[PDB]
Nucleic acid binder design. Structure first.
Ligand SMILES: [Mg+2]
Ligand SMILES: [Mg+2]
Ligand SMILES: [Mg+2]
Ligand SMILES: [Mg+2]
Lengths: 177, 104, 136, 175, 84
RNA sequence: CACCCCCGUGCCCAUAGCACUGUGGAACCACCCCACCCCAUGCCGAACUGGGUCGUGAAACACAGCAGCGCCAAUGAUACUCGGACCGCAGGGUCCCGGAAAAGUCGGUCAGCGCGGGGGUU
RNA sequence: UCCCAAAAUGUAACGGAGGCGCCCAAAGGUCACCUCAAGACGGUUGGAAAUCGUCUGUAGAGCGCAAAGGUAGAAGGUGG
């Protein structure tokens, strides 16, 4: 259930593409997340439930309601009010969910076509802007509530995006060529 | 990060005290259960686990604590103070602790 | 002219120049030689006159902005407190200071663009030229 | 410039037309006091990019450079001067004025060219051969032509301390 | 009544009696109890042998000689280098 | 203080800080590994924490170079002023006598000083 | 509480500005731990800010209200 090819396909193939004075120094995958900034436009002390319950059955983890920065800008804004959600993955659960995505997530996406190239976190880290959650190997409309979306963060010791991109894809990743 | 050791260290009073402080570098498995006197940047006793360990390093825990309390004795010390660090008074450290907190 | 926003009032005191360079923004400049209050309408009276003389170029620098509110008599009385936040705005000038300095136009075609401007000033000035090299 | 005295007390000069400078480098920062008139006629030309003869009373010619002059306000007259003795192969950094030549193609056109920065400073001058001026092309310049440091031809060697893309002269529009 | 404000805005009456400062300067033979410094924030921090009132004040715990220490500003300290 | 370096803890607390560059590994450090439960992250043993290699030195760290930036910062002359003595209707200003800046310039430096434990000089 | 007040304190005016007549079972005692504003790049209803993420970051934020001093080795932010 992964990691060998992780090192292998990546690490080796890397030096066998790169030249790392170490095995440690090679870019890796620190953590994958899921921000659930719902509400605000939808004040549903009801829908908040849709989130976690779900997010949790899709990442296998209880997330945090990343409440309002206490920001109360002109428009609908206020003190610290539940608005979004944080769900940090790293390692096992990271990889366990991760693989799903690389296998069933995107692959199982009607209208799917791959993923934009253009470097993101020039910090060698990738950013993943997801949407319609109607492409999950765990999401069910015939046992849910309404229907939403979500964003997932790619964290990697990837120094440069050069090395990032590589790793990124080696472990598995769709690029729209 | 460094807030923690400075929080503990600071709260740990210096001269107003009179007492002595006992450090500990148990972040690694190379502790030092050091003992220093207020003013003069002088370490009196001290009982790490450097001279071997017989395999124990998280294990030699109380060995060094007991190796220390015992130590001071050959200086005769009644009052001391636990200037631990980031280390949140748990196990490996409570070792040197209880250990010395009686070995003396 | 009049500042854009601020506190609202002030006071009064004096002592020789402090931040009035010399050459900068041009070759020719006009310098004030006496402690005074320069009315904002006394600057326009200067700029505007200077413009006319210059059929183009605008190389006129007015570097003495009105950072000051003065007050006045609501008519007479004296039994009330602070008065007239709005009489007018002035810009305390001190000797050696540089209010004006044209640019591009002939000496003479400048020794006149000032002369005039002088005639509407409460203080005596004198035109300066170059050799101004302190900080830059 | 035969400066002769050099004491903390200037009564003997303040009344008698005599400026009062100081010179140095890192060795000797000899107290000083030169003559009004002379310096007065002097610095005009060589300005700060001109080393001159400093034979102090007794005769000891020395090489320096006009570093910083602080004159009286109210009275255009100068009061104090700093002479930073020349060097041999490296002084520090110097202030060199920008100049124009030949009518610009913006002048007759309809506007006037403006010199955003009169005197310009470049990194490392070069003692013995330090540009006592700096003529620059302007002609080309039309209605909005800005010239910078990355342009001005330098005198074989000299490097520009002033940031490149910094406009030294532009031809300002009309009115 | 009417239809305006209560009191005329833009006034100037009143201010406050106020105090603060330094009660005991450097070299003064302080004493047990003596107050040496009244301040608002932590202008001077309770050095060695000085207590610290709830109002950031400072006082002596024992007797001895008043002592001042200014480390590049920001942090100040009053101490007591007793004679005895 | 035999020579060195390493780890911990001080004084000092930017002329002891940054950055850019190079050096170090299996003594020490760290990363790294697993971690059901001790104890734990309002989700994540990331951090706290428990049990330990290998591998690495890449990162973090230590050290060393460097001064491009920081920080330090003269002298000279000036601002200002205690004291004395004058001017101008006034705004303001002056002489003699001491004190004497700030900014900038010269130049200065990338510390220095302790205690203790460890491991080396095959 | 600021300024006036003339670098100790104090010091007037129908001088210049502004707040109080409360509030908090916890916004307290103590014991643990975290640390800010903000910009930039990259990311979903979003698209101006705001949520997530990654760099910079004497703190340019915060501190129940008015201001001042003060403060991150916390008086800033959670829990027993
Ligand atoms: Mg400075
Ligand atoms: Mg005197
Ligand atoms: Mg006097
Ligand atoms: Mg004098």
């Amino acid at each position: 259930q992964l990691k060998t090819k992780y090192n292998d396909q990546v690490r080796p193939a890397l030096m066998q593409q790169f030249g790392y004075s170490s095995v440690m120094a090679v870019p890796r995958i620190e953590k994958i997340v899921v921000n659930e900034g719902l509400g605000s436009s939808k004040e549903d002390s009801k829908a908040i439930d849709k989130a976690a319950k779900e997010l949790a059955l899709i990442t296998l983890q209880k997330p945090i309601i990343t409440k309002a920065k206490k920001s109360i800008s002109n428009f609908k804004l206020r003190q610290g009010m539940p608005v979004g959600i944080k769900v940090t993955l790293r390692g096992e659960r990271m990889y366990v969910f991760l693989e799903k995505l690389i296998n069933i997530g995107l692959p199982r996406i009607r209208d799917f076509r791959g993923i934009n190239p253009n470097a993101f976190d020039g910090r060698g880290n990738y950013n993943l802007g997801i949407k319609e959650q109607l492409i999950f190997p765990e999401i069910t409309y015939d046992m849910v509530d309404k229907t939403r979306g979500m964003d997932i963060t790619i964290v990697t010791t990837a120094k440069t995006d050069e090395e990032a991109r590589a790793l990124l894809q080696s472990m598995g990743l769709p690029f729209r060529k | 990060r460094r807030k923690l050791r400075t929080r503990r260290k600071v709260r740990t009073t210096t001269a107003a005290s009179g007492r002595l402080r006992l450090s500990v570098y148990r972040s690694s498995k190379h502790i030092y259960a050091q003992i220093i006197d207020d003013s003069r940047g002088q370490t009196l006793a001290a009982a790490s686990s450097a001279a071997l360990k017989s395999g124990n390093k998280t294990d030699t825990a109380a060995a060094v604590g007991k190796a220390l309390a015992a130590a001071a004795a050959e200086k005769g010390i009644k009052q001391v103070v636990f200037d631990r660090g980031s280390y949140k008074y748990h196990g490996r450290v409570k070792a040197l602790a209880d250990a010395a907190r009686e070995g003396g | 002219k009049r500042t854009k926003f601020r506190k609202q009032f002030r006071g009064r005191m004096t002592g020789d120049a402090k931040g009035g360079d010399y050459v900068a923004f041009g070759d020719y400049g006009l310098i004030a030689m006496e402690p005074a209050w320069i009315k904002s309408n006394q600057i326009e009276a200067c700029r505007i006159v200077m413009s006319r003389h210059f059929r183009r170029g605008g190389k006129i620098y007015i570097r003495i902005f009105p950072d000051k509110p003065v007050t006045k008599k609501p008519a007479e009385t004296r039994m009330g407190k602070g008065k007239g936040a709005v009489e007018y705005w002035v810009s305390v000038v001190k000797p050696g200071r540089v209010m004006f300095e044209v640019a591009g136009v002939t000496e003479e075609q400048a020794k006149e663009a000032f002369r005039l401007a002088g005639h509407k000033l409460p203080i005596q000035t004198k035109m300066v030229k170059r050799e101004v090299y302190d900080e830059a | 410039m035969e400066l002769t005295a050099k004491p903390r007390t200037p009564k003997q000069k303040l009344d008698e037309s005599m400026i009062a400078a100081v010179a140095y480098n890192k060795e000797n920062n000899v107290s000083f006091a030169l003559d009004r008139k002379a310096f007065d006629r002097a610095f005009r030309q060589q300005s700060t990019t001109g080393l001159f003869d400093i034979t102090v009373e007794g005769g000891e010619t020395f090489p320096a450079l006009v570093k910083a002059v602080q004159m009286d306000k109210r009275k255009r007259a100068p009061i104090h001067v700093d002479f930073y003795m020349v060097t041999y192969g490296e002084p520090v950094e110097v202030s060199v004025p920008v100049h124009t030549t030949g009518r610009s193609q913006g002048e007759v056109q309809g506007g006037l060219v403006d010199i955003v920065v009169h005197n310009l400073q470049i990194v490392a001058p070069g003692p013995r051969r330090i540009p006592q001026e700096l003529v620059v092309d302007v002609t080309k310049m039309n209605i909005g032509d800005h010239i910078t440091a990355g342009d001005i031809k330098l005198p074989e060697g000299c490097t520009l301390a002033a940031d490149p893309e910094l406009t030294v002269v532009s031809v300002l529009p009309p009115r | 009544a009417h239809k305006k404000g209560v009191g005329s805005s833009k006034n100037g009456r009143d201010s406050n009696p106020k105090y603060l400062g330094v009660k005991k300067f450097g070299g003064e033979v302080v004493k047990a109890g003596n107050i040496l410094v009244r301040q608002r924030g932590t202008k001077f921090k309770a050095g060695q042998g000085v207590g610290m009132g709830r109002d950031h004040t400072l006082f002596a715990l024992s007797d001895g000689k008043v002592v001042f220490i200014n480390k590049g500003k920001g942090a100040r300290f009053i101490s007591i280098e007793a004679a005895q």
